[PDB]
Amino acid sequence: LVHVASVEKGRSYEDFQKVYNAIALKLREDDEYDNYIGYGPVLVRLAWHISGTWDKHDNTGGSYGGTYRFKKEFNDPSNAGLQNGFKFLEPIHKEFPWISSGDLFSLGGVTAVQEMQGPKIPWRCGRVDTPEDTTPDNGRLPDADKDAGYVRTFFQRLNMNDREVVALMGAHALGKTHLKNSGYEGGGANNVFTNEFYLNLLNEDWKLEKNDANNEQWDSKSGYMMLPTDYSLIQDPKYLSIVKEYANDQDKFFKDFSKAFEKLLENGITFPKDAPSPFIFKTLEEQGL
Ligand code: HEM
Ligand SMILES: CN1C=C(N)C=CC1
Structure with missing residues (x-):
């Protein structure tokens, strides 16, 4: 099973830095969540759980297909609580309807790590939403x-x-x-x-x-x-x-x-040799925003 990264048509670094910035600004705004922890941690966990379904043996699961949007995965008991992260990302997806679901969920985690003063985590675009029948069964986390x-x-x-x-x-x-x-x-x-x-x-x-x-x-x-x-x-x-x-x-x-973490978020994805290099997004702080 082969999943080839396909860049969102016409998009480049700058488009994704705007998505990053919208996530980052929302992270700053919505500060009261979980007794003032904010949404950073849950977004990291979401990125991990959408990736951690992957099985190297047959290339099932993984971040590529964005399958967390489907009820079987959304309702996995292992994912209890992640609905909060999904609902945080919904207005971001509204604003940037062109980004794939797997790209958004994974980018949410990168954005959270960085805005929380973590390392820079290079990120690649091009996950493509796959159909409901490609959703992995519960029990892989x-x-x-x-x-x-x-x-x-x-x-x-x-x-x-x-x-x-x-x-x-x-x-x-x-x-x-x-x-x-x-x-x-x-x-x-x-x-x-x-x-x-x-x-x-x-x-x-x-x-x-x-x-x-x-x-x-x-x-x-x-x-x-x-x-x-x-x-x-x-x-x-x-x-x-x-x-x-x-x-x-x-x-x-x-x-x-x-x-x-980059590896985790990329497992299962084939990047063409002329794909863009990984993007390293600037933090809001680095941009003076
Ligand atoms: C053996 C592996 C792991 C197990 C068994 C595990 C288990 C758990 C459990 C039971 C929770 C609490 C969930 C809740 O009650 O809301 C949790 C939270 C969390 N996990 Fe893991 N985890 C593992 C690996 C990881 C990895 C690899 C990452 C990401 C790199 C991660 C990131 C997080 C984060 C950020 C939270 C906090 C979520 C929040 O505050 O809402 N976990 N984990
Ligand atoms: C603060 N946290 C502590 C753990 N033991 C697991 C997840 C998060």
Whole structure:
């Protein structure tokens, strides 16, 4: 199964920087969401979930087709809460009806990471909306109650190695868990992209507790929480080395996250050799906006 990137007719960098800017300005405006976290974190999670359906074995799923717009995927229990991100993006799509759905969802995540002071994440256009019958079944996104071996195996389906997994997981510095979405809860409120996920793993005094949904999670006094799968990154010796590396090198973390996140958002897509180079968007701050 081959998905060839096809640039939205006539469009160029500048068109996409205007979409980026509309997303970024809305992120600034709609500040009250989720007790003033704002929409950044949910948009990152949306971009990941629309991509994380991909299966390297047959090229099913993935960001290309924009299939989250269809009820089977929209209603996946693994996607509970992402409707908030979709509804944030609806007026953006209204304004720029020419962008594909996969382009919009993925660009939302890039815009969120950057506006949250994260690394620059190069982004390529040309995902093309595919029909309802191409929507992947539920059950392709990962469970949170499992161990390191589960995480490692899971991510092989997405063609991600240990470093890529540990880097991607650093997004769990952002936002929070909500009991009614996932059966996990914490006092998370962070909307600045940093390496503090790794610092927190190493430096906090973690307690394995049961939450109000009767699920186990790791809690600290300071208010942080880690899923079992997060904590597994310090229970496995190979993951632990990489957690230490990122806890000790913010720039390396940024660089590795950028590469892994772009890769995640591009898995399954064939870029023609005369496709445009990846775009690196300016932040609102860089533009004086
Ligand atoms: C083993 C892999 C992973 C598991 C089991 C997992 C699980 C979860 C769970 C259960 C939540 C809480 C959802 C809710 O209650 O609203 C969550 C939130 C989140 N996840 Fe993951 N996740 C994983 C990987 C990732 C990756 C790879 C990224 C992106 C690079 C990501 C980004 C996020 C973000 C940004 C949030 C916060 C959402 C918000 O604040 O609304 N996750 N994750
Ligand atoms: C703040 N967050 C904490 C986690 N353990 C997972 C997602 C987000």
